[model samples]
Target: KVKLFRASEPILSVLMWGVNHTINELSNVPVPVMLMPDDFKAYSKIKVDNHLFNKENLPSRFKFKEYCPMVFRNLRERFGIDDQDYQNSVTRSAPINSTRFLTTYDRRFVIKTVSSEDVAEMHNILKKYHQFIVECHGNTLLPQFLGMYRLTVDGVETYMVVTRNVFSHRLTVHRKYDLKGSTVAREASDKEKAKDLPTFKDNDFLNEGQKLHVGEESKKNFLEKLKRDVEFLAQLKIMDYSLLVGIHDVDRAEQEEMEVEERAEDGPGEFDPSVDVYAMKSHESSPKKEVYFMAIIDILTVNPEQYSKRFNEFMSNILT
Candidate 1:
């Protein structure tokens, strides 16, 4: 969500009142308020009176205007960058062509405005699919929802949702192996060789002369991870079907691209279970990197039944 600063009491009061009212009327929860100077400086100006609610008489405890104005002034004097230029540099100017933006803290986030119509549709979907993720191991595959807001842009009102960023690394194995063209005996031998190699930190597990072995190991590990992911998604499908909710078919190709893209976009963050699978399959089998935790960075959209059927067919052919 985009941030705005209020330097005048009149403006700050209006914002606080509007935010409070929005929460009360919509979600029925009051969000914890905090002052973030970095967030505040993203806006063009600190208007005190352009909000939906008039907040001149709200309690003094909510008077961020007093402190925020001083903070802005201090930053201007200390940094020597005009407030407008500073805001433009940080928020308006796009250093990259993509919608994704990486913060100084190294956390990746996207800022895109959703239309009012889409917001209504999202609310409907949320209402219908509320328990799908929670029923399956809660917080395993989904990013934490940070917050939501409504903002006016170019005379249009839009809603925005913020979520935690998932960082990832591309498994080079997928690119190197083609199951359709390779013989099972050759693949099996390579897989066995990869399992004997030493592991590397940061999930790097490849070495010279071990590329084929790593590729074979990668296929086995990938299938295993895919099985686990499908299992979790199967639970959701069962719950949805049982509840008589409409089942939306997930696009596997799109889902796979998203998984790779999320990791590629975020750069290197941490090596966890996802990396461990790759490391275990690498030609160097030594466990050099410590496994701390595991998280499902993304989800496949295809129906669980379809996935199960396809996997069974593939495995049967390989076994025979």
Candidate 2:
């Protein structure tokens, strides 16, 4: 079972009021504010120790700003209920098409949106590796699909599917390359020079501070956690060398096939190969929190067969 964390109404209302006030102040006008301090206190009272709110701990910028706000908005529009009502509800609004809710409301559940195209792709993949990709609701890495529905935006109808949101640490990888002129000291062997050896940088995530040093002990702990995560995915038969290779190939093809206009002249390569290489390096040198998080999300969302092949290749190459 996954643990979920949700914010109470008081906290949300306060945050909203703060945001609105900030926006209003920037606009040089005061808006009538109805929120009370007592309300905020009530909201803050329901706190958990999850790092979901910590800025440094976030998986991405999208998760930092948009993920929760979009969720709150979805809840407001879908249930026709205010934050207070949602806080009191027991079921906590499991993932549903076109809806988002506070993470504090439920820890085990995750809300995600899927388009018709996404569904078509997913359906096709499932036909071959049905068990590998657990349908939403099953006890697996794949989220259980609760239901499907439609929403109209600007007079256009859009379809959505919802499923479970798995829980994991937000792992990020940072890489620093050696300068071109740096010569291998005689003390360092050729094997060491050839390693292109990457130094591991771990972010404590919770407390904002300097990068955590990856000593031998730290490496052991990190690898233990990472190995468990990978093995879990592999155990589900959702990870394999072939799957990763297919994903890599498809990604490569997509990159090669992209129109020049779509490709930025100055931007990084099609997928930022650095991230992949960094993740692989981190898995070996030390623990990469962000990479792990991304891999988990990718596993849940991407095609099982392709993902399996990609992951296997990735693991085999890096681990070996």
Candidate 3:
């Protein structure tokens, strides 16, 4: 049943079929008033042995499991995301591929493969994560982890985690960085820097003297969120994670001309807080026009004094 996603690659086609089926079956189950403790341990397993069952691009047989299904669905709703939209985003088209990473064709959700150990780590912190999200009311700079799953094909199990895309769907990021607020072993090789979209690092940012012009108010709020989140991670015996910064440059150029086609859309250089929640606009003093997408990512990893001190000094220089 690859009707929506016809003529796709093998893994992607199987993924679409699996996600579609999972969402359908889950829909039949009534939503509970609250998730039980076992809900965290609950998972939905599907095994398909298709001799030729609707195979356009999928394997003859595969297995899929949705971990903490009820909990993740509730989390999605709490974050103002609808299940159908989530399903459509992934199943409707082929996702962009990378090492243990995939971006939905619609560019709404990011799918990342994790290890068995990482799954255990997530279980240890899962409850704390839910509470944190609830307390913050879905407003934080931390990664917006949306879903987690496991898919087995040819008897090989592949674990996955899903999160909201850090960048805007419509707007394009001209440059981005994967910053850890430190200098040690944090840089891109010349080979990597030559790619179509290179993930630069703290050293590169400092060398470029990049400052995010988010103004006084935005900076204050951002830092406060970081302080609370970092303090919590440290308490949980975790390392402070990294940030994925996507800088979108708007110009009077052709990208701006897109505004003409999108009359109902915000004019050039503007962003939607509801959708692209983490994106921030550059201040007037910024050397070039840009919008920034910044969220603490890879939460699965903390240092204390050195981490805090280095973070403060690093951010102060890059921000006004």
Candidate 4:
């Protein structure tokens, strides 16, 4: 079935249409016993130059390009994501937008718009990125790159990449921060903090004396993952990335569980790390009751590496 998506914005509508078309098309192709070298370098390009057809929702002439679908499909499996669910999350409804962050209806995936240079960067690092995901068995806290694409409408091209949300699909983030593990110029502005949910910063985190407690095992694993992942970034010379910390206060979650209950139909606010992957339940021994979504962000950070060692240091200290 060709799922037709309705969105107020034409670009979003085209995005939905493109995702729907590509995934369904991939469903028809057979899975290889093993991926060939060319699989890492494949793409599907479709040009829609509509005149009187589907003009209400999409542009008259828009082009869609999906890169390395076979490879990304495998990556999704490695990350334990079902392709169908991934598709449904995106095509289900209009995405919530903030700058370049496009959150799906269910907030399970992020559709990020990248630059032409970012696309080139993805190609440059594609092999190592795949190998890294393989070595980690998709267990790292890095952004889980799922898919990449190029969309063109009215002669302008826009590149996009998809990844699983660092935040949970079900939880509400009460407090969040974008920490670079720095002291200077890392706090959120008063205007920024006034929002219902603001992305706070490094100085804000330390000055407020905020600490994340995830017990011995989680901390051990979290730091280990951070160590390897941070080094991976340094290897790519990928700098300016931030450790995005999203704290979901369980007390608040309990109050909001009524809404969550109807949707999840199971554990209202609780989660299984094997499934949630990047989330850590607060330790029973210390700190307030909560859950934490900790993942490296801004890997698309258009930028170098001594900073990474320091990044790991300040990050490890931010915890109990």
RMSD of each: 17.3, 20.5, 3.8, 3.4
Give one digit per residue, the lDDT tens place, for model 4 in 228-314: 999998999788889989998887778776676787886654787766778888898765688899999888732357878889999
List model 1 lDDT by residue over 1-320, tens digit each. Answer: 43332323322223334333432332332322433444333222222333545323432223211112322233332323333433333233232222223221222232333456644543443422333333432223232332334543233343544333332222222212212111122233444447532222111211222222233554455445445544544544421110000111124324666799899987121234422222332234422221111223222144557654453344323310
Candidate 4's C-alpha runs over 4 A off are 256-269, 301-303
Q: Which ranking of candidates, highest lDDT first?
A: 4, 3, 1, 2
Residue 75's lDDT in candidate 1 = 30
Clashes of 3: 4
Q: How many clashes in each structure?
A: 11, 28, 4, 0
How does model 4 score by TM-score? 0.92
Better of 2 and 4 by lDDT: 4
Point out the higher-scoring one by lDDT: 3 or 4: 4
Question: Model 3: clashing residue pairs?
Answer: 238-302, 239-301, 239-302, 240-302
When summed lDDT is taken over every stretch of 10 residues in candidate 2, the lowest stretch is: 58-67
The residue-by-residue lDDT of candidate 3 on 228-280, one tens digit each, is: 77666766777657777888878843555667779867568787788888888
Off by over 4 Å in 1: 1-105, 112-121, 127-130, 168-320
Name model 2 segments beyond 4 Å from true.
1-104, 126-144, 168-295, 298-310, 316-320
Worst 10 residues of 4 by lDDT: 299-308
Candidate 1 residue-wise lDDT at 141: 28
> Of the candidates shown, which would achieve the greatest TM-score relative to the real structure?
4
Better model by TM-score: candidate 1 vs candidate 3: 3
Q: What order do you get sorting by TM-score, best first?
A: 4, 3, 1, 2
